[PDB]
Design an enzyme around this catalytic site. Structure first.
Site, short mmCIF file in Angstrom:
data_model
loop_
_atom_site.label_atom_id
_atom_site.label_comp_id
_atom_site.label_asym_id
_atom_site.label_seq_id
_atom_site.Cartn_x
_atom_site.Cartn_y
_atom_site.Cartn_z
CB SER A 1 -1.48 -3.09 -6.57
OG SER A 1 -1.98 -4.32 -7.45
CG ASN B 1 -1.00 -2.17 -2.56
OD1 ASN B 1 -2.11 -1.88 -1.89
ND2 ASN B 1 -0.35 -3.15 -2.85
CE1 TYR B 2 -2.77 4.97 -0.04
CE2 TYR B 2 -2.83 5.29 -2.41
CZ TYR B 2 -2.26 5.76 -1.23
OH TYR B 2 -1.36 6.64 -1.21
NE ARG B 3 -1.65 -4.07 2.06
CZ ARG B 3 -0.64 -3.20 1.76
NH1 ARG B 3 -0.58 -2.44 0.92
NH2 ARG B 3 0.33 -3.14 2.62
CG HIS C 1 6.13 0.55 -7.27
ND1 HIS C 1 7.31 1.00 -7.74
CD2 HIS C 1 6.02 -0.79 -7.56
CE1 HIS C 1 7.86 0.25 -8.37
NE2 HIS C 1 7.23 -0.99 -8.20
#
Lengths: 256, 259
Positions: A106, A122-124, A120
């Site tokens: 993140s 974010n990769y999850r 911003h």
């Protein structure tokens, strides 16, 4: 370096390797257009959480404040936790706690110059475990976006174009769906922003292919953001404009 | 204390007084359900900006990280500066720079417990000046929302209900307009996406007498503690594991949001 890139290892291991590699690539890339460097966040907490590391940048000539974090977690979901998550995950089924693994990167970056936009990203990945430790229920989530102070359409267009190109390498039906649509909708229905892409509970394809999709999405970031910041970071602006933009977006509380 | 309230002073002074009063009310309110106190943000950075103070809370038993800031600014908007803002301000016109004043309160709170939601709130005012120092072009902007980790529809409903009540005291036509809850429109395209709470938002708002809008802002401010403290109290003591908290931090990017 030493990041792994085959297709035989479990998805959880490939994903952790991917995000740790990108954290280094991204911080290096951002540093290439600033005069300061990222540093480990050794802030004193009680339960800092996470498994990876938190890199922070501050008081630079290009980026006023920013952070890129990698976190990895191993734990268990109680029946209650599952119940609270069920409605957002089409395949999450309670069937006694269940073990899980999750990891993700993140980041948030705030440029000094109001003509450059905040971003911003974010990769999850998340997976519950079968008795034998193999993935039971899993999914990927993430995306990236821009939040402008001063809005430049060309910048929003470039950001979207590169992310579209990334998704198009897999399925041209992905970008139109993943494109953030809400703010634009309210803008039309009422008499502005940039947005970006976002997806969650994404388990619709072979996970090995989604891994690559995530890698391609990661790769749309530096080419779009560095290009955008380069053409805005040295634009003239007064202290007054900067101060107003900070009040408009409450930046002071965002990074404090 | 010492805040003002009569509709005699210039809007700029009344607004500054209002946000400073609310900054104190809000920090005290949040502290009432925690064990730690807010403290000044004394960091040596590039530019502090603002004309007020930045109160920060951290490592509380209820709130993990949080801040409430009040900033005030005076200056002159050059012709080029004014031209870069006209895009979204219906009455901002070109006419040598023009003096201006702006102020606002901004805040973000992150609770420790994933069953409690994160919240963002911001109320501000902007005005350019006439030769005699009075307002020429002015407007208010603001909003408040919740960003859940674990989602509780009842909490979102309460938050929205109290803000609707505040706006209804002025014009029942305002809430349906200022409301921003994307979930309400998932149906149009059979969109299957992660649920949210949203909140209320408005900007470049200069549609009524500024004295009435100032009151509208005060009423909106007063919808915050009754809804947020109520929500946090009913969630802050719910059981959760360290790992659950970590996952919620991963999906919301908490650590970097703290900065």
């Amino acid at each position: 370096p030493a990041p792994q890139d085959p297709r035989n290892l479990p998805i959880r291991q490939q994903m952790e390797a991917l995000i740790r590699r990108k954290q280094a690539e991204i911080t290096q890339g951002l540093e290439s257009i600033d005069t300061v460097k990222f540093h480990a966040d050794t802030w004193t907490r009680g339960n800092d959480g996470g498994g990876g590391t938190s890199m922070v940048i501050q008081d630079g000539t290009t980026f006023e404040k920013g952070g890129v974090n990698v976190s990895v977690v191993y734990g268990q979901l109680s029946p209650a936790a599952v119940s609270a998550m069920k409605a957002d995950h089409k395949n999450l089924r309670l069937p006694d706690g269940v073990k899980f693994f999750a990891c993700g990167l993140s980041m948030v970056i705030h440029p000094v110059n109001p003509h450059a936009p905040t971003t911003h990203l974010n990769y999850r990945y998340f997976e519950t475990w079968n008795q034998d430790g193999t993935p039971q229920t899993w999914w990927f989530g993430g995306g990236a976006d821009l939040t402008p102070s001063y809005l430049y359409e060309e910048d929003g267009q470039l950001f979207h174009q590169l992310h579209k190109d990334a998704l198009d390498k897999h399925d041209t039906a992905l970008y139109p769906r993943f494109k953030k649509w809400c703010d634009e909708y309210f803008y039309i229905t009422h008499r502005r922003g940039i947005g970006g892409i976002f997806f969650d509970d994404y388990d619709e394809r072979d996970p090995q292919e989604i891994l690559k999709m995530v890698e391609d999405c990661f790769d749309a970031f530096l080419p779009s953001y560095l290009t955008i910041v380069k053409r805005r970071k040295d634009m003239p602006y007064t202290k007054e404009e900067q101060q107003w933009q900070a009040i408009r977006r409450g930046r002071y509380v965002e990074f404090n």
